[PDB]
Write a protein that binds this DNA or RNA. Structure first.
Lengths: 140, 44, 232, 662, 174
RNA sequence: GUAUAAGCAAUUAUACAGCGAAACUGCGAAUGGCUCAUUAAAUCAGUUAUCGUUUAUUUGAUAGUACCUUACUACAUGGAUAACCGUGGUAAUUCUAGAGCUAAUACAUGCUGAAAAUCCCGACUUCGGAAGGGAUGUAUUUAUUAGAUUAAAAACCAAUGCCCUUCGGGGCGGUGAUUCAUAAUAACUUCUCGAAUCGCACGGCCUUGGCCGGCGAUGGUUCAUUCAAAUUUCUGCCCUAUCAACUUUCGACGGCUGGGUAUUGGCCAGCCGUGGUGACAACGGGUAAGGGUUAGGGCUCGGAGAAGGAGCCUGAGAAACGGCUACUACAUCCAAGGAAGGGCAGGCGCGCAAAUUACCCAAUCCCGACACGGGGAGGUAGUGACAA
């Protein structure tokens, strides 16, 4: 392994840390301000820029190396029944270690450049809720 | 698993790799002196 | 080589010019926001009859567009290009109407001398110099330091310098150049930010119709001050 | 010429010697004009380095060829990357032993030149030219590259380089055709300014008239008027002169040099950096005078010959600078104050110490945007050194004025070492005077700086007289403002303050009824007003203590747990409506305390008390008060219900006020 | 055959797909350049927009940045020390980006004794970390490659100093 | 742009002058349209983004970069070839060999009149205009610094003041965001650009030996803009559980490091972690492959191959199928040594049958050094008892 670094900041001088705000009415967490982890797919540490769509949802599987899957439920209109039906989708998002992670919580994600085959999103805000496992349902 | 891109020797009979070359025995020695040779190396 | 129906609905063609329609050449204005010079000469004004007659007008130095001689036939002239013909002694100006089509306006040299162009972007160019990009793709070096985005500028057109500018304002009357409410001369009375893409303005006409148009599709024309003569 | 160089190298290879034989391929690629910079780092730092056996054979040929490539003007670009980096990339890779032959082919006629003889100046040599003014420029640019690439290793080549640079310099100084001689002069001065701190041990004493003719003749009678804009090459040379210990005896040859150098500081239209540069030249001179046995060879010379007859003009220029203009840069302020810091232990007698003390107390009554607190500690060190000169006995109104400042900076500072040196400047104040009284203040503030047991001992001893009291009051309100080490310090400071105001109410004689009452107004009442906003509850408790003691003991002065708290607030309500109040008291003491009561039925009781007091304060204060409360609305999303209840109570008080004033 | 498309791989739901379309010239990916140590061998590739990128296959020298003092000098390249990705690049001496490689020290040593004057590796502003001083006494420093040699035509970079220097010394010891 | 055609046509000041075949040079052919195993939200549609990318042409701005040991110097810059002229070989058309030329806006180098030039500062000042101080592009790549009032930021914020007063009053770059745009230092490049071009008018100063001078064409670095192309976000396919497990069987999901790409990305390579989807219908199977314009109908838009695999070349844009190479398979000429080449349309498809092998770019449109040259879209005409 190689020494992780913020790509253009001169640490070895004998005479800091770069963190940008994402914007969009958000606040930088204290771990993203001073916490000594280094991750280049972090929108507060690396150079990844959030633009475009802004989504929310509830996590299925937190247990993964910095990537969470969101079950997004919605109500589709079948015209044969003239009715609303539940349809669940699964998104993937890269997780900064700045936030405190929970399972079943409602998490805000944001759209970035493609970071992998699935990963197109980063976490921006986590709402800590007591949401349950796969049996729980709410359109969100 | 951690084995996929050729890391694990997947012993599968390959279809176009099946009948390339005929075995051509080109050995100028008569098979009775050769097995006596491999015995009498540095140990014997 | 598009068909006459696939040509856009705002530079008009009748049942006359064949099934085909000329495409505008690449230039300052866009493709779908465009009036070519052949459609301006022989399909709108009817100073000509045929393509070869339009070529015989264009190739001799008789048609000047934005104060410079434009030779090629399908040169794009979309919005507010003063078109000076000297043998007839006329200068036409391109504006829109309330329905959403191109309109021609005859005028003389005093209003023909300047162009009201909307600023597209302000930046720092090479040499450490601020420069200014309008919708005519005119870049002006060393502008006035308050002329920000979506401000309009009175371009000199004999030197090309800045003469005056109109700021983006809630209370300044404006012209719509896009969208489902296209071509409706009214006053900007409200502006909503919508940060994260595609902000809007709320705009009313002279006679009380409110509607929401995007800040890309707007175009400032003057507070009261009709600096170009909209046709009476 | 590249073609003639190629044919000449072909003839050198026609000379068939085994020293040149393994290097021919490396040689010809240097004349192939596309592969020169790559072939240089193939030749040096390669697997085929030059073998030291036949290094004696290849090096003259190679250095003539590299010299020609460094000369040639054709393929090179413009700017520095054109041919300046080429000369640098040749000389940076050349050895210091080959550099002798390199400068030998460099200096054609100036190889065997002599500038200085047993006498002073060789006018017979100097009234003749061996080189064109076109040709000396490339020579000086090359020697600048040689010196900047060599460094110390010039020491075996001292005897000819200085003759070359001095010859071109004095031919230019005679020729003040302008442009070529001017560039010759400037780049030779840059080369010399590098060469001086290149060579410390070389003997510069056999020529002094050459520096004389380079300095005193064209510039010195106009030098500050010239150098008002930017730093020059003469200044760049005098800088490394002031840095070098054996070169500072070049400034004594003309007596008027340092007068014109501080006259440059005197001229106020200068763009700040020639000022701080002359200031740095003076810093280096005083550091050299303060240096040990190394610089003690010429310490006495610079002491008795340079600074001693011009102390007065130095202090006059620094005084005019510090009192004249309304805009002074922070860099100039810190640097000049540090010069006065280092220059004060060098002067024993002088003339303008009255002025300098008044300057120091002026710069210490200056505000904090103009003067940094680190700069204030340095002007404190200035005070500490300048005070011991026997001056405060005459002009006693100056001495009372500086004592007002020494007292005023006691509650200002937050640093232990600065308070130590504060106690020291008050000590030498006491040694110079009244004397027993200021010595008593000295022992008090001394054991104040002294740790917790000696501090409480100081507090008790002071617990057990106007100019006696004032510094104790300033340091005492500072010791209020400390929240807690154990919490004891603020209580002891409050009890000492109660002792002080008890002494004030003990003195009610009329010509002191003026003075002590003006003091307890101006020092103590805004201190309580500003300490009302202190977030520490024990500090609020002790300010509550001293304010209650003031109201209980004073009254003839004209300008003056949960359930018990609610009860006292209701009594304050009733006391308000029975007697309206003093408006500055209402604005600056009670409202932030009740605000703190809210933000740490207590909240509704507090809003009731603010709704009472809003009738008793004035609308001009109420305007900015209401604006601060809407600022609390927009800035504080944490207690929205509390701030909006407060707002509703205040606008009910507003309608009450307007309905009363109709 | 070497391409950049995603039509051969399985989907996010775990499904393969036929999706047969021919390989196109914007899905073009060319063969890798294992840039090794030798004399200069660079081939110029023209690319989309007519733009040239310089495929360097054998390289000798590059400039390296001793930038805490303010210099960069063109030095040769001795041999690759370690590579974070592969071991075969360490075995066959392949210059890629983020490769720690040892370089010569002579122009840096020359500039140190030329600017400051105190000799090195044989007042107070001239100060050298003693690990880096051991590298100077060896005459062979531990640089790291920051420029892409394959897609620029040069192997340049900055020298290792301090924490990264100690980290890659510990990684060499690993 | 290049004319000495031994090409035509001439005279009133002879290098050239007008027309100008041949040839060199620049542009062009990402399609017009053909065939047939198909593509089942992957294409496609709405809807985003490029702060993740390339862009010939368009039109608009655009480049302060001299000196720096050749001086006992340099100061109308080089060499190739084509066309052409001749001598030929072979059965075999530029399949070509030998010999002799000559041009460039083709390829290529490119210190100089001069003691100055050009940028930033400016003291003194009569608007005087300036003594004298610092300094010497661009493209690539890397490291670093600045990207902006102070950081002892202990500031500014409590102007809730302070002073005067007549008590009325007076005074004290852009973005939502970036390491973005931009500027600078150190170097680096077998690295570019910074006009040795062509046409037309030809005017001021008079050293009558020139010094200056205008309008364009061609070319050039960077940023635009246009025309594009490439990915990319949420939703929307028809049916089916005689399809309940599927992916890891070309890596299946990450994250780190690099490679390659114009750029992001398991896209690919090394290291490890345990995944990803699915009864809310994954996966598999069936093959029968619409959107917008809203009285209405109408109108508009909508994968694989060039005899078969495999590899390569140009260009801004192709994996052109235009060319090449090898293998495979047909097939042609020959003097038997050799040499060039791979489509559709039409008729017959019984021995008995039924719509022109029509004319033009004249309109609308497109491509070029370009008003003229070139276009298998388009329009004009002919047949017709199938009807009407």
């Amino acid at each position: 392994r190689a020494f992780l670094k913020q790509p253009h900041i001169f640490l070895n001088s004998k005479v800091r840390r770069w963190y940008k705000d994402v914007g969009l009415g958000f606040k930088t967490p204290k771990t993203a301000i001073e916490g000594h982890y280094i991750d280049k797919k972090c929108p507060f540490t690396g150079m990844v820029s959030i633009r475009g769509r802004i989504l929310t949802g509830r996590v299925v599987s937190t247990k993964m190396h910095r990537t969470i899957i969101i079950r997004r439920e919605y109500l589709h209109y079948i015209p044969k029944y003239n009715r609303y039906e539940k349809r669940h989708k699964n998104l993937a998002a890269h997780v900064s270690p700045a936030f405190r992670v929970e399972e079943g919580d409602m998490v805000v994600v944001g759209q970035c450049r493609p970071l992998s085959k699935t990963v197109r999103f980063n976490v921006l805000r986590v709402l800590p809720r007591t949401g349950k496992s796969v049996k729980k349902f709410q359109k969100f | 698993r951690r084995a996929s891109k050729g890391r694990k020797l997947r012993y599968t009979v390959h279809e176009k790799l099946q009948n390339f070359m005929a075995p051509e025995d080109r050995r100028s020695w008569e098979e009775h002196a050769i097995d006596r040779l491999f015995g009498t190396l540095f140990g014997q | 080589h598009q068909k006459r129906l696939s040509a856009p609905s705002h530079w008009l063609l009748d049942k006359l010019s064949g099934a085909y329609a000329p495409r505008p050449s690449t230039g300052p204005h866009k493709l779908r926001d465009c009036m070519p010079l052949i459609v301006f000469v022989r399909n709108r004004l009817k100073y000509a009859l045929n393509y070869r007659e339009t070529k015989a007008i264009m190739m001799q130095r008789l048609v000047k567009v934005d104060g410079k001689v434009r030779t090629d036939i399908t040169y794009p002239a979309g919005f507010m290009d003063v078109i000076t013909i000297e043998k007839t002694g006329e200068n036409f100006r391109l504006i829109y109407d309330t329905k959403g089509r191109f309109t021609v306006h005859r005028i003389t040299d005093e209003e023909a001398k300047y162009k009201l162009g909307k600023v597209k972007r302000v930046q720092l160019g090479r040499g450490g110099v601020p420069f200014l990009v309008t919708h005519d793709a005119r870049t002006i070096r060393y502008p006035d330091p308050l002329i920000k985005v979506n401000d309009t500028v009175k371009i000199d057109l004999e030197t090309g310098k800045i003469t005056d500018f109109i700021k983006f304002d809630t209370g300044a009357l404006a012209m719509i150049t896009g969208g489902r409410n296209m071509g409706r001369v009214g006053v900007i009375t409200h502006r909503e930010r919508h940060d994260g893409g595609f902000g809007i303005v709320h705009l009313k006409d002279a006679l009380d119709n409110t509607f929401a148009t995007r800040e890309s599709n707007v175009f400032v024309i003057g507070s009261e001050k009709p600096w170009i003569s909209l046709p009476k | 010429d590249i073609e003639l160089q190629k044919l000449a190298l072909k003839a050198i290879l026609t000379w068939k010697s085994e020293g040149i034989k393994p290097y021919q391929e490396h040689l010809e690629y240097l004349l192939d004009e596309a592969r020169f910079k790559n072939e240089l780092t193939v030749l040096f730092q390669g697997d085929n380095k030059i073998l030291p056996e036949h290094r004696s054979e290849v090096i003259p040929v190679l250095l003539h060829l590299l010299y020609g490539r460094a000369i040639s003007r054709k393929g090179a670009a413009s700017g520095r990357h054109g041919l300046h980096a080429t000369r640098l990339a040749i000389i940076r890779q050349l050895d210091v032993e080959d550099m002798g032959s390199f400068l030998d082919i460099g200096l054609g006629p100036l190889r065997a030149i002599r500038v200085v003889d047993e006498q002073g100046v060789r006018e017979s040599v100097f009234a003749h030219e061996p080189l064109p003014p076109r040709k000396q420029v490339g020579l000086l640019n090359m020697l600048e590259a040689v010196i900047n690439e060599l460094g110390t290793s010039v020491e075996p080549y001292m005897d000819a380089l200085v003759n070359s640079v001095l010859y071109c310099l004095v031919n230019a100084c005679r020729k003040l055709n302008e442009s070529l001689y001017r560039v010759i002069r400037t780049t030779a001065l840059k080369s010399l300014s590098r060469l001086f701190q290149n060579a410390p041990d070389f003997n510069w004493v056999p020529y002094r008239e050459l520096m004389v003719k380079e300095i005193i003749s064209p510039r010195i009678e106009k030098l500050p008027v010239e150098s008002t804009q930017g730093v020059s090459a003469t200044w760049r040379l005098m800088a490394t002169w002031s840095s070098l210990p054996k070169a500072a005896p070049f400034l004594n040859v003309d007596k008027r040099i340092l007068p014109k150098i501080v006259e440059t500081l005197s001229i106020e239209k200068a763009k700040d950096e020639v000022k701080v540069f002359a200031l740095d030249i003076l810093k280096n001179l005083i550091n050299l005078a303060q240096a040990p046995e190394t610089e003690s060879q010429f310490n006495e010379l610079i002491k008795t010959e340079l600074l001693d007859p011009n102390t007065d003009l130095i202090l006059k220029t620094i005084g005019g600078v510090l009192h004249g203009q309304s805009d002074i840069g922070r860099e100039l302020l810190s640097s000049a104050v540090d010069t006065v810091v280092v220059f004060a232990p060098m002067i024993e007698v002088s003339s303008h110490i009255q002025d300098m003390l008044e300057i120091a107390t002026w710069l210490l009554n200056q505000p904090l945007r103009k003067v940094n607190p680190k700069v204030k500690g340095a002007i404190l060190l200035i005070l500490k050194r300048f005070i011991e000169l026997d001056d405060l006995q005459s002009n006693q109104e100056l001495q009372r004025k500086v004592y007002s400042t020494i007292s005023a900076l006691f509650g200002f500072f937050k640093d232990k070492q600065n308070r130590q040196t504060l106690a020291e400047v008050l000590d030498v104040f006491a040694r110079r005077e009244w004397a027993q009284e200021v010595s008593d203040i000295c022992r008090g503030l001394n054991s104040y700086v002294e740790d917790y047991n000696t501090r409480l001992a100081a507090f008790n001893s002071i617990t057990k007289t106007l100019d006696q009291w004032m510094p104790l009051v300033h340091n005492l309100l500072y010791f209020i403002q400390q929240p807690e080490e154990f919490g004891v310090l603020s209580s002891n400071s409050a009890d000492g303050l109660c002792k002080f105001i008890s002494a004030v109410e003990s003195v009610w004689a009329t010509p002191d009824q003026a003075a002590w009452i003006d003091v307890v107004a101006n020092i103590i009442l805004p201190a309580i007003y500003a300490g009302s906003r202190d977030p520490s509850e024990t500090v609020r408790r002790e300010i509550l203590r001293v304010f209650g003691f003031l109201v209980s003991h004073l009254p003839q002065w004209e300008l003056v747990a949960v359930s018990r708290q609610l009860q006292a607030l209701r009594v304050l309500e009733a006391a308000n409506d029975k007697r309206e109040f003093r408006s500055k008291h209402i604005s600056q003491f009670f409202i932030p305390l009740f605000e703190h009561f809210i933000f740490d039925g207590l909240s509704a009781q507090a809003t009731n008390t603010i709704a009472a007091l809003t009738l008793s304060l004035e609308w001009q204060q109420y305007r900015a008060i209401l604006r601060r409360f809407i600022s609390y609305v927009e800035s504080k999303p944490d207690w929205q219900k509390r701030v909006v209840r407060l707002l509703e109570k205040e606008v009910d008080a507003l309608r009450t006020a307007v309905a009363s004033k109709k | 055959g070497i391409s950049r498309d995603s039509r051969h791989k399985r989907s996010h739901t775990g499904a393969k797909r036929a999706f047969y379309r021919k390989k196109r010239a914007f899905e073009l990916g060319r063969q890798p350049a294992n840039t090794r140590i030798g004399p200069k061998r660079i081939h110029i590739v023209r690319t989309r927009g007519g733009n040239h990128k310089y495929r360097a296959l054998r390289l000798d020298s590059g400039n390296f940045a001793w930038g805490s003092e303010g210099c960069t000098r063109k030095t040769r390249i001795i041999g690759v020390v370690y590579h974070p990705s592969n071991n075969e690049l360490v075995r066959t001496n392949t210059l890629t980006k983020s490769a720690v490689v040892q370089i010569d020290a002579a122009p840096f040593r020359q500039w140190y004794e030329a600017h400051y004057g105190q000799p090195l590796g044989r007042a107070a502003h001239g100060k050298v970390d003693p690990a880096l001083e051991k590298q100077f006494e060896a005459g062979r420093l531990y640089a790291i490659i920051s420029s892409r040699p394959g897609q620029s035509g040069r192997a340049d970079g900055y020298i290792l100093e301090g924490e990264e220097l100690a980290f890659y010394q510990r990684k060499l010891h690993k």
